[PDB]
């Protein structure tokens, strides 16, 4: 029926409805640190989120998205391996039922508790819908979460979750600053890949940060309280909404550091 992360509609079945699932540039992937090529030509990332305007948070049935106003160059990413300006449209997470799983990308086969995705689209394409149809249409910043100390800047997010518990619920969510979710270092790995949920379009330049951010056990615990189902439907906790690593194929992972 429709795709999800259960046994009957999970990642292993997606190819039946979205054949690109077995494509040449699918994500996520395992990052082999000893095979990644340091590339001295990659520039430092430029994250300008001081003018970021958050608008709302929504449970879409597969994760929760925080959405931003992308009608102007308010929150942008540039530099790194990118040409042009990429505007932030939304962020969301992937997480596990247990602390030893949850991330999509892995590092030398290590899985983290969760993975944050900051999605941006290439302004030359005019809108999100056109950007996904192009090989360089999106730039996703991925950040790993490990469980340790609480992340103060994530608390406002944790606290509104009760109000968007089931699929299709939304809540006003203004004045959230995404700078509070960045690690100290912007060192990264980069490779050409795809969206990690259907339609799995291969339109993404991934920028994966080397340094994880820490969140407390209690913080991640609140994520696991969301539901995949809509209100008044049988309860299915939103856990394990991650796609496993895909074959690298003909691709090189480049590192911005040594
Ligand atoms: Co994602």
mmCIF file of C-alpha atoms and ligand atoms in Angstrom:
data_model
loop_
_atom_site.group_PDB
_atom_site.id
_atom_site.type_symbol
_atom_site.label_atom_id
_atom_site.label_comp_id
_atom_site.label_asym_id
_atom_site.label_seq_id
_atom_site.Cartn_x
_atom_site.Cartn_y
_atom_site.Cartn_z
ATOM 1 C CA UNK A 1 0.000 0.000 0.000
ATOM 2 C CA UNK A 2 1.677 3.365 0.759
ATOM 3 C CA UNK A 3 5.347 3.350 1.739
ATOM 4 C CA UNK A 4 6.504 3.532 5.324
ATOM 5 C CA UNK A 5 9.075 1.844 7.541
ATOM 6 C CA UNK A 6 7.129 -1.288 8.584
ATOM 7 C CA UNK A 7 7.782 -4.893 7.544
ATOM 8 C CA UNK A 8 5.224 -4.786 4.746
ATOM 9 C CA UNK A 9 5.957 -1.358 3.251
ATOM 10 C CA UNK A 10 9.551 -0.696 4.393
ATOM 11 C CA UNK A 11 12.611 0.335 2.411
ATOM 12 C CA UNK A 12 13.064 -3.077 0.888
ATOM 13 C CA UNK A 13 9.736 -2.703 -0.895
ATOM 14 C CA UNK A 14 10.062 0.874 -2.175
ATOM 15 C CA UNK A 15 11.544 -0.155 -5.528
ATOM 16 C CA UNK A 16 8.140 -1.595 -6.637
ATOM 17 C CA UNK A 17 6.580 1.891 -6.674
ATOM 18 C CA UNK A 18 9.819 3.942 -7.162
ATOM 19 C CA UNK A 19 12.220 2.045 -9.445
ATOM 20 C CA UNK A 20 14.868 4.738 -8.954
ATOM 21 C CA UNK A 21 15.316 3.093 -5.530
ATOM 22 C CA UNK A 22 17.860 0.825 -7.269
ATOM 23 C CA UNK A 23 19.457 3.810 -9.070
ATOM 24 C CA UNK A 24 23.167 4.660 -9.461
ATOM 25 C CA UNK A 25 23.198 7.544 -6.990
ATOM 26 C CA UNK A 26 21.074 6.492 -4.026
ATOM 27 C CA UNK A 27 21.448 7.611 -0.460
ATOM 28 C CA UNK A 28 22.292 7.189 2.328
ATOM 29 C CA UNK A 29 25.714 5.472 2.133
ATOM 30 C CA UNK A 30 28.416 4.235 4.547
ATOM 31 C CA UNK A 31 31.301 6.761 4.783
ATOM 32 C CA UNK A 32 34.550 4.765 4.704
ATOM 33 C CA UNK A 33 36.932 7.297 6.285
ATOM 34 C CA UNK A 34 40.077 5.690 4.880
ATOM 35 C CA UNK A 35 38.800 5.701 1.267
ATOM 36 C CA UNK A 36 37.362 9.240 1.298
ATOM 37 C CA UNK A 37 39.655 11.577 -0.695
ATOM 38 C CA UNK A 38 40.765 14.790 0.941
ATOM 39 C CA UNK A 39 40.163 17.481 -1.753
ATOM 40 C CA UNK A 40 42.028 20.772 -1.115
ATOM 41 C CA UNK A 41 39.925 22.516 -3.747
ATOM 42 C CA UNK A 42 36.749 22.302 -1.630
ATOM 43 C CA UNK A 43 35.946 25.632 0.025
ATOM 44 C CA UNK A 44 34.653 26.067 3.575
ATOM 45 C CA UNK A 45 30.867 26.006 3.884
ATOM 46 C CA UNK A 46 29.086 29.323 4.322
ATOM 47 C CA UNK A 47 25.954 29.030 6.493
ATOM 48 C CA UNK A 48 23.960 32.279 6.764
ATOM 49 C CA UNK A 49 21.003 31.595 9.011
ATOM 50 C CA UNK A 50 20.864 34.873 10.966
ATOM 51 C CA UNK A 51 17.738 35.988 9.052
ATOM 52 C CA UNK A 52 16.018 32.551 9.227
ATOM 53 C CA UNK A 53 12.215 32.703 9.568
ATOM 54 C CA UNK A 54 10.618 29.486 10.918
ATOM 55 C CA UNK A 55 6.872 29.226 10.365
ATOM 56 C CA UNK A 56 5.459 25.872 11.425
ATOM 57 C CA UNK A 57 6.141 22.324 12.542
ATOM 58 C CA UNK A 58 4.233 19.436 10.952
ATOM 59 C CA UNK A 59 3.886 15.679 11.517
ATOM 60 C CA UNK A 60 3.742 14.387 7.901
ATOM 61 C CA UNK A 61 3.419 10.758 8.923
ATOM 62 C CA UNK A 62 7.059 9.848 8.275
ATOM 63 C CA UNK A 63 8.896 12.456 10.433
ATOM 64 C CA UNK A 64 8.300 16.002 11.679
ATOM 65 C CA UNK A 65 9.353 18.951 9.513
ATOM 66 C CA UNK A 66 10.120 22.466 10.776
ATOM 67 C CA UNK A 67 9.389 24.750 7.767
ATOM 68 C CA UNK A 68 10.892 28.111 6.941
ATOM 69 C CA UNK A 69 9.870 30.998 4.762
ATOM 70 C CA UNK A 70 11.882 30.426 1.511
ATOM 71 C CA UNK A 71 10.347 33.315 -0.514
ATOM 72 C CA UNK A 72 13.622 35.272 -0.262
ATOM 73 C CA UNK A 73 17.305 34.708 0.513
ATOM 74 C CA UNK A 74 16.884 34.668 4.315
ATOM 75 C CA UNK A 75 18.567 31.378 5.386
ATOM 76 C CA UNK A 76 21.113 30.178 2.806
ATOM 77 C CA UNK A 77 23.941 27.797 2.287
ATOM 78 C CA UNK A 78 26.729 28.381 -0.194
ATOM 79 C CA UNK A 79 30.403 27.538 -0.611
ATOM 80 C CA UNK A 80 31.683 24.019 0.039
ATOM 81 C CA UNK A 81 31.158 21.986 -3.128
ATOM 82 C CA UNK A 82 28.250 24.194 -4.229
ATOM 83 C CA UNK A 83 27.836 26.649 -7.055
ATOM 84 C CA UNK A 84 25.077 29.213 -6.386
ATOM 85 C CA UNK A 85 22.889 29.881 -3.403
ATOM 86 C CA UNK A 86 20.681 27.312 -1.745
ATOM 87 C CA UNK A 87 17.762 28.501 0.415
ATOM 88 C CA UNK A 88 16.685 26.534 3.494
ATOM 89 C CA UNK A 89 13.101 25.223 3.154
ATOM 90 C CA UNK A 90 12.854 22.732 6.064
ATOM 91 C CA UNK A 91 14.738 20.473 8.512
ATOM 92 C CA UNK A 92 13.673 17.042 9.940
ATOM 93 C CA UNK A 93 15.263 14.069 11.732
ATOM 94 C CA UNK A 94 15.575 10.290 11.319
ATOM 95 C CA UNK A 95 15.828 8.326 14.616
ATOM 96 C CA UNK A 96 15.796 4.843 16.097
ATOM 97 C CA UNK A 97 13.820 2.801 18.605
ATOM 98 C CA UNK A 98 17.117 2.308 20.529
ATOM 99 C CA UNK A 99 20.175 4.519 21.000
ATOM 100 C CA UNK A 100 22.419 2.296 18.837
ATOM 101 C CA UNK A 101 20.513 3.030 15.629
ATOM 102 C CA UNK A 102 18.655 5.867 13.938
ATOM 103 C CA UNK A 103 21.110 7.614 11.549
ATOM 104 C CA UNK A 104 20.877 7.052 7.812
ATOM 105 C CA UNK A 105 24.513 7.675 6.931
ATOM 106 C CA UNK A 106 27.039 5.619 8.834
ATOM 107 C CA UNK A 107 30.756 6.288 9.444
ATOM 108 C CA UNK A 108 33.030 3.251 9.124
ATOM 109 C CA UNK A 109 29.773 1.315 9.763
ATOM 110 C CA UNK A 110 29.032 3.198 13.008
ATOM 111 C CA UNK A 111 25.370 4.168 13.397
ATOM 112 C CA UNK A 112 24.392 7.207 15.516
ATOM 113 C CA UNK A 113 21.162 7.695 17.503
ATOM 114 C CA UNK A 114 19.711 10.124 14.971
ATOM 115 C CA UNK A 115 20.437 12.296 11.943
ATOM 116 C CA UNK A 116 19.300 15.852 11.285
ATOM 117 C CA UNK A 117 18.689 16.904 7.651
ATOM 118 C CA UNK A 118 18.639 20.647 6.728
ATOM 119 C CA UNK A 119 17.160 20.753 3.214
ATOM 120 C CA UNK A 120 18.032 23.590 0.818
ATOM 121 C CA UNK A 121 17.119 24.179 -2.865
ATOM 122 C CA UNK A 122 19.123 25.845 -5.664
ATOM 123 C CA UNK A 123 17.702 29.330 -6.235
ATOM 124 C CA UNK A 124 18.468 29.219 -9.961
ATOM 125 C CA UNK A 125 15.486 26.847 -10.341
ATOM 126 C CA UNK A 126 12.937 29.297 -8.865
ATOM 127 C CA UNK A 127 11.085 26.833 -6.613
ATOM 128 C CA UNK A 128 11.539 23.532 -4.745
ATOM 129 C CA UNK A 129 9.402 21.560 -7.175
ATOM 130 C CA UNK A 130 11.666 22.506 -10.120
ATOM 131 C CA UNK A 131 14.880 22.044 -8.089
ATOM 132 C CA UNK A 132 14.145 18.325 -7.363
ATOM 133 C CA UNK A 133 14.150 17.602 -11.103
ATOM 134 C CA UNK A 134 17.821 18.694 -11.503
ATOM 135 C CA UNK A 135 21.077 16.942 -10.674
ATOM 136 C CA UNK A 136 22.276 19.912 -8.570
ATOM 137 C CA UNK A 137 18.841 20.980 -7.343
ATOM 138 C CA UNK A 138 19.227 20.359 -3.612
ATOM 139 C CA UNK A 139 21.912 20.544 -0.967
ATOM 140 C CA UNK A 140 21.220 18.620 2.248
ATOM 141 C CA UNK A 141 23.338 19.224 5.357
ATOM 142 C CA UNK A 142 23.390 16.043 7.515
ATOM 143 C CA UNK A 143 24.396 16.194 11.242
ATOM 144 C CA UNK A 144 24.688 13.125 13.466
ATOM 145 C CA UNK A 145 23.252 13.062 16.983
ATOM 146 C CA UNK A 146 24.841 10.977 19.741
ATOM 147 C CA UNK A 147 23.266 10.612 23.247
ATOM 148 C CA UNK A 148 25.185 12.400 25.992
ATOM 149 C CA UNK A 149 24.542 15.932 27.257
ATOM 150 C CA UNK A 150 21.326 17.812 26.381
ATOM 151 C CA UNK A 151 21.347 20.274 23.493
ATOM 152 C CA UNK A 152 19.737 23.464 24.803
ATOM 153 C CA UNK A 153 18.877 24.728 21.314
ATOM 154 C CA UNK A 154 16.843 21.588 20.570
ATOM 155 C CA UNK A 155 14.512 21.989 23.602
ATOM 156 C CA UNK A 156 11.948 24.291 21.953
ATOM 157 C CA UNK A 157 11.505 21.541 19.345
ATOM 158 C CA UNK A 158 11.131 18.773 21.929
ATOM 159 C CA UNK A 159 8.545 20.721 23.867
ATOM 160 C CA UNK A 160 6.048 21.225 20.966
ATOM 161 C CA UNK A 161 6.046 17.545 19.953
ATOM 162 C CA UNK A 162 3.027 16.755 22.187
ATOM 163 C CA UNK A 163 0.934 19.074 20.042
ATOM 164 C CA UNK A 164 1.734 17.374 16.693
ATOM 165 C CA UNK A 165 1.547 13.807 17.915
ATOM 166 C CA UNK A 166 -0.217 12.277 14.918
ATOM 167 C CA UNK A 167 -0.066 12.458 11.140
ATOM 168 C CA UNK A 168 -1.348 15.677 9.602
ATOM 169 C CA UNK A 169 -1.134 17.775 12.780
ATOM 170 C CA UNK A 170 0.721 21.087 12.598
ATOM 171 C CA UNK A 171 1.640 23.873 15.002
ATOM 172 C CA UNK A 172 2.777 27.490 14.602
ATOM 173 C CA UNK A 173 6.549 27.501 15.252
ATOM 174 C CA UNK A 174 8.006 30.996 14.796
ATOM 175 C CA UNK A 175 11.289 32.463 15.888
ATOM 176 C CA UNK A 176 13.262 29.186 16.045
ATOM 177 C CA UNK A 177 16.967 29.711 15.237
ATOM 178 C CA UNK A 178 18.571 26.723 13.502
ATOM 179 C CA UNK A 179 22.058 27.957 14.445
ATOM 180 C CA UNK A 180 21.461 26.290 17.806
ATOM 181 C CA UNK A 181 21.735 22.846 16.060
ATOM 182 C CA UNK A 182 25.200 23.244 14.464
ATOM 183 C CA UNK A 183 28.288 21.550 15.859
ATOM 184 C CA UNK A 184 31.356 23.747 16.492
ATOM 185 C CA UNK A 185 33.271 22.526 13.398
ATOM 186 C CA UNK A 186 32.007 22.639 9.796
ATOM 187 C CA UNK A 187 34.436 19.994 8.467
ATOM 188 C CA UNK A 188 32.525 17.659 6.119
ATOM 189 C CA UNK A 189 32.322 14.855 3.635
ATOM 190 C CA UNK A 190 30.450 15.338 0.344
ATOM 191 C CA UNK A 191 29.054 13.126 -2.384
ATOM 192 C CA UNK A 192 26.299 13.232 -5.033
ATOM 193 C CA UNK A 193 23.194 11.312 -3.885
ATOM 194 C CA UNK A 194 19.390 11.390 -3.554
ATOM 195 C CA UNK A 195 16.419 12.046 -1.268
ATOM 196 C CA UNK A 196 16.206 9.242 1.303
ATOM 197 C CA UNK A 197 12.399 8.959 1.152
ATOM 198 C CA UNK A 198 10.212 8.401 -1.947
ATOM 199 C CA UNK A 199 10.346 9.838 -4.552
ATOM 200 C CA UNK A 200 14.081 9.135 -4.001
ATOM 201 C CA UNK A 201 15.076 11.643 -6.743
ATOM 202 C CA UNK A 202 18.840 11.858 -7.408
ATOM 203 C CA UNK A 203 19.042 15.604 -7.093
ATOM 204 C CA UNK A 204 21.082 16.008 -3.931
ATOM 205 C CA UNK A 205 24.560 17.129 -3.146
ATOM 206 C CA UNK A 206 25.009 15.743 0.402
ATOM 207 C CA UNK A 207 27.135 17.641 2.912
ATOM 208 C CA UNK A 208 27.683 15.418 5.947
ATOM 209 C CA UNK A 209 29.331 17.018 9.017
ATOM 210 C CA UNK A 210 32.141 15.119 10.675
ATOM 211 C CA UNK A 211 31.313 16.307 14.172
ATOM 212 C CA UNK A 212 28.133 15.026 15.853
ATOM 213 C CA UNK A 213 26.022 17.111 18.243
ATOM 214 C CA UNK A 214 24.997 15.573 21.595
ATOM 215 C CA UNK A 215 21.392 15.260 22.813
ATOM 216 C CA UNK A 216 20.206 13.814 26.119
ATOM 217 C CA UNK A 217 18.410 10.493 26.441
ATOM 218 C CA UNK A 218 15.276 12.380 27.555
ATOM 219 C CA UNK A 219 15.353 14.550 24.444
ATOM 220 C CA UNK A 220 15.493 11.566 22.057
ATOM 221 C CA UNK A 221 12.892 9.820 24.223
ATOM 222 C CA UNK A 222 10.347 12.517 23.270
ATOM 223 C CA UNK A 223 10.968 11.865 19.577
ATOM 224 C CA UNK A 224 9.984 8.229 20.040
ATOM 225 C CA UNK A 225 6.569 9.342 21.375
ATOM 226 C CA UNK A 226 5.300 10.585 18.024
ATOM 227 C CA UNK A 227 3.009 8.470 15.904
ATOM 228 C CA UNK A 228 3.081 7.433 12.260
ATOM 229 C CA UNK A 229 -0.754 7.142 12.287
ATOM 230 C CA UNK A 230 -3.423 9.822 12.185
ATOM 231 C CA UNK A 231 -5.650 10.702 15.127
ATOM 232 C CA UNK A 232 -8.189 8.061 16.147
ATOM 233 C CA UNK A 233 -6.213 5.330 14.318
ATOM 234 C CA UNK A 234 -4.394 2.505 16.051
ATOM 235 C CA UNK A 235 -1.145 3.719 17.570
ATOM 236 C CA UNK A 236 2.124 2.988 15.764
ATOM 237 C CA UNK A 237 5.095 4.824 17.376
ATOM 238 C CA UNK A 238 7.261 6.838 14.916
ATOM 239 C CA UNK A 239 10.623 5.027 15.456
ATOM 240 C CA UNK A 240 13.203 3.668 13.034
ATOM 241 C CA UNK A 241 12.252 6.051 10.190
ATOM 242 C CA UNK A 242 15.694 5.552 8.549
ATOM 243 C CA UNK A 243 16.700 3.963 5.257
ATOM 244 C CA UNK A 244 19.757 1.690 5.411
ATOM 245 C CA UNK A 245 22.992 2.390 3.511
ATOM 246 C CA UNK A 246 22.895 1.904 -0.297
ATOM 247 C CA UNK A 247 25.690 0.788 -2.655
ATOM 248 C CA UNK A 248 28.220 3.519 -3.446
ATOM 249 C CA UNK A 249 28.602 2.344 -7.044
ATOM 250 C CA UNK A 250 30.571 4.733 -9.275
ATOM 251 C CA UNK A 251 30.920 7.495 -6.657
ATOM 252 C CA UNK A 252 33.726 9.127 -4.673
ATOM 253 C CA UNK A 253 33.249 10.589 -1.231
ATOM 254 C CA UNK A 254 35.441 13.724 -0.895
ATOM 255 C CA UNK A 255 36.546 15.122 2.506
ATOM 256 C CA UNK A 256 37.087 18.852 3.243
ATOM 257 C CA UNK A 257 39.678 17.848 5.886
ATOM 258 C CA UNK A 258 42.593 15.569 6.534
HETATM 259 CO CO1 LIG B 1 16.023 13.121 5.798
#
